Amino acid sequence: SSVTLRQLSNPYYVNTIPEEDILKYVSYTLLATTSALFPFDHEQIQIPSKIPNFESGLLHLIFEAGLLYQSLGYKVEKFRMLNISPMKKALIIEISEELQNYTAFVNNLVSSGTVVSLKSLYREIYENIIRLRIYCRFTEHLEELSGDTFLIELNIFKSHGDLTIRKIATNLFNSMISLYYEYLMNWLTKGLLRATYGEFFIAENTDTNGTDDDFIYHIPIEFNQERVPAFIPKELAYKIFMIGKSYIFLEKYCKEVQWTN
Amino acid sequence: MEIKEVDDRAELLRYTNNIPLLGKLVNHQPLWSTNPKLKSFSLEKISAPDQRRVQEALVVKDLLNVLIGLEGTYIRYFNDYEPSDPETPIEFKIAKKMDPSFKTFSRRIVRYGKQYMILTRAYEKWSDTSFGMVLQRFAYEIRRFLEDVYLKTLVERLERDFNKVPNFSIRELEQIINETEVNKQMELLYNIYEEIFREIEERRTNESSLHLRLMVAFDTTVYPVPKGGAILKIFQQKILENLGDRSSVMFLKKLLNNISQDYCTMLYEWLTQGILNDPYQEFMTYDDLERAWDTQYFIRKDVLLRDCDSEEDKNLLFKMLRTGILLKVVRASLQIPTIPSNSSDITIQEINDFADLMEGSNLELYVDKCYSRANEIFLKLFFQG
Amino acid sequence: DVPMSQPLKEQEVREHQMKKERFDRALESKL
């Protein structure tokens, strides 16, 4: 009579792990920590035999977030330890921001006590899985790529039909480009080329050859037109170059420091 | 039920070189057919009246999993299903020992599960940059549908009732699927998928304007993907197919209204600013030069909004091109990124609704206004400047 | 029916346009 279909099906799942136990250890896995129920290794999540294939399949999907989270966390540390362009850091920072948001999100759902089923869980976390998938793919080979390269790809993604893609591509771009802006300012107001790692089109000319090593005729600044980004019209890229070059000329050789300053 | 010892492992796929940007980046549970994990149950043991209700409970549990693309206890993936190769056909085996009333309901319900898996897979594929922009937005809309409606219903209404309703039955399950019209929406999306798909398979398989021309070529390349106007036309056709069904067309219109926003935005800027930015090649036109003044123009016949086998559409097409070209020249001459609203006193409103623009001779008047603005501004500068 | 020519102005206008186009096309075909 009053018995529900789940109650009727229960006798056949008596040897399996109940939903509560799953839910209790899933959140730990979602944050890429490990547990006795889900012996999560440095890479793989061991899935015990007491989880039926139906549930295993759903958990493969749910746990994707933990796996993606783990991967992103690892590269964040990889980069934290390296001396890299601040624009790469801008991306790293954004990754960390996303991971922090993820964390809050997961903890909210879990601590709310409103997740009573994996299906509900999956549906709620689904968007975050995607967001992580996006970062995970955008950060592939991050270390092999230059800051400009990412800005270019981001510009492409900023027009992508998917709205989450646009939000992420836009935000990542904004974070990085704001430092490009800073590089440009350093050049424009200080004549400064610093920590460019070759990502800035204006470079120190270190290719000396005896004649003029004292920079009497030449001021050691390169204008690499081929490295000028899409967002800087050629005319300005050159003008920018000449502004800083002039700054240097003036400050270094004419010594009109009070004015210059 | 007894448990077989199977060591499953969840892991990230190691290679993503051929994985769509939004596709799954993890492995999958082994199939029943290779690693059963549970001991088989014969069904017949519980087939008697008053045992049958349990069999039903077990069947419903399976359907709930089937509807999200998972196999169940008595419903198994098709033998040649290959989860590691997402081209694989989707089909299911129903335990033959199942009560025939259930076997019947199951086929009716599993069908939605098939659409689910396909649509899910399709939007993931469509995230690739090789796909058109409008299609990418469509893929987005599908994904949202599934989260907003499909699964919302499944999770909050149906699983919940399985767990809590004493008289829930497979009969109700079918009723719900239909009464909420979720299935209808699934079918409509599905049918769109099939139409697109078919069109793609065909794509994979296969002077009257001279007096008004400049250095322009007609690009007849047939793309593997029905980008731009080609997708938009499908939607128009689907509306025609659904005429008389108000719910269906409203649904379809909402989709069109959403997917077309970027296309019409791109169009707007071309027509009011002369600014065309089309990294996904959706637009009806493109030019050369990605000194550099010898601009060649191209007409992308395959993504046009109108086929232009009529005089009116040909005339419209060219006026539209000229509009944008005149504006481009002005921007180039003035070395301005944009032409302000404070120039010729013509206000051109944004396209808010693509379909509304396509409906009636709205393109003709909209474009005439756009054209006129381009023309007046152009003339002012050329004559007086 | 009466074995008669269509109107003359139209015939001449067509000749003028065809001649103009013949000329224009001599050039459009390469230019």
Residue numbers in the entry:
A (entry chain C): 163 to 423
B (entry chain D): 1 to 206, 223 to 306, 318 to 412
C (entry chain U): 112 to 142
What's the paper's own text on this?
Microtubule (MT) nucleation is regulated by the γ-tubulin ring complex (γTuRC), conserved from yeast to humans. In budding yeast, homologues of the grip-containing proteins (GCPs) GCP2 and GCP3 (Spc97p and Spc98p) and two copies of γ–tubulin (Tub4p) form a 300 kDa complex (γTuSC). Spc110p, a distant pericentrin homologue, recruits this complex to the nuclear face of the spindle pole body (SPB), while Spc72p recruits it to the cytoplasmic face. In yeast, the CM1 motif is required for seven identical γTuSCs to helically assemble into a γTuRC at the SPB.
Finally, by local 3D classification we observed that a closed state is populated in our γTuRCWT data. This state had previously not been observed in the γTuRCWT structure as robust symmetry expansion and 3D classification techniques had not yet been developed for cryo-EM when the structure was published. While not identical to the disulfide crosslinked closed state, the differences are minimal, indicating that the conformational changes observed at highest resolution in γTuRCSS are representative of those occurring in the closed WT γTuRCs. The fact that the WT closed state can occur spontaneously and is sampled in our open population suggests that, in the presence of Spc110p, the energy differences between the open and closed states are not large. The observation that a population of γTuRCs in the WT filaments adopts a locally closed conformation indicates a small energetic barrier to a single γTuSC closing, although simultaneous closing of an entire ring is unlikely.
